[PDB]
Amino acid sequence: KPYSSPPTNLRSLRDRLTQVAERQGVVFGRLQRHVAMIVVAQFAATLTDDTGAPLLLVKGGSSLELRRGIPDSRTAKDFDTVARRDIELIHEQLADAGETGWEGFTAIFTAPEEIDVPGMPVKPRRFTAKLSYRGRAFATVPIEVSSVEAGNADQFDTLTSDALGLVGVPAAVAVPCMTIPWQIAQKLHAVTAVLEEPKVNDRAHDLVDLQLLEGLLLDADLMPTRSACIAIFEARAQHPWPPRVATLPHWPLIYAGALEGLDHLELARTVDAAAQAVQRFVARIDRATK
Ligand SMILES: [Ca+2]
Ligand SMILES: [Ca+2]
Ligand SMILES: [Ca+2]
Ligand SMILES: [Ca+2]
Ligand SMILES: [Ca+2]
Ligand SMILES: [Ca+2]
Ligand SMILES: [Mg+2]
Ligand SMILES: [Mg+2]
Ligand SMILES: [Mg+2]
Ligand SMILES: [Mg+2]
Ligand SMILES: [Mg+2]
Ligand SMILES: [Mg+2]
Ligand SMILES: [Mg+2]
Ligand SMILES: [Mg+2]
Ligand SMILES: [Mg+2]
């Protein structure tokens, strides 16, 4: 019943994914996207400095999916990371990792393209990973790499998934991820940000993620989060801490879309209630003391 040998080719891989997807009540395309993300995360995990510490930390929706699993996180598309040092050399190192491969997977990476974010000195970069399993194309993963901000790469959590073990690839998965205090700080900044006039803030989905991250902190002391928040809002030098969690007129349906598949969770069911919940969390963070 549990595959003893790894898949022999892509067809057997997809074949096995579809069976695991139905087996645990998940959409096939999501499980396959999840596996593609894990493969690229394992490439990233081979990148270390000369003391063995990670060079790349995962963040964004990929990290939330690793923390909570597929059923309890939003479906997200990209592989967002923070580069611990020198961003230009990350691409070359990933390309080498993908050429060497991991458990039969290989990757070719497209050229990095800068993107403008006013609050960051060094601009993030975006590119794509073209994944193949035993020579035959498998999936495509959008990748975003941003430079370190304050102490958001000082520490990392190490997360796992058994998805590849379920289709017969047993090699252990261990993914360094940006810690929750810094995820909260950056999402709070993004969801409360006022963009330059032409652009508009669409990030109502961050209201879902912030509720999920708050729940993941359980009873933890909020002082690390408060410090991280203060550090991000000051480094970025835009709107100050603590922010106001305002809702824009087009967010009701964007927030509703972000709830898709999460009916079983205890979440705010309207954007107003979501804004009120995240505003309470902001105040709870601000009250923390050493
Ligand atoms: Ca994040
Ligand atoms: Ca994902
Ligand atoms: Ca810091
Ligand atoms: Ca909590
Ligand atoms: Ca106001
Ligand atoms: Ca609505
Ligand atoms: Mg599951
Ligand atoms: Mg290590
Ligand atoms: Mg994602
Ligand atoms: Mg830690
Ligand atoms: Mg940690
Ligand atoms: Mg799984
Ligand atoms: Mg827009
Ligand atoms: Mg629905
Ligand atoms: Mg409920």
Author numbering: 3 to 292
The study reports:
We found that while Rv1045 encodes the guanylyltransferase TglT (unusual type guanylyltransferase-like toxin), which arrests bacterial growth, Rv1044 encodes the atypical protein kinase TakA (unusual type of atypical kinase antitoxin), which neutralizes the activity of TglT via phosphorylation. It encompasses an N-terminal domain (NTD) and a C-terminal domain (CTD). The NTD (1-181aa) exhibits an α/β fold that commonly found in nucleotidyltransferase-like proteins. A large central cavity is formed between NTD and CTD.
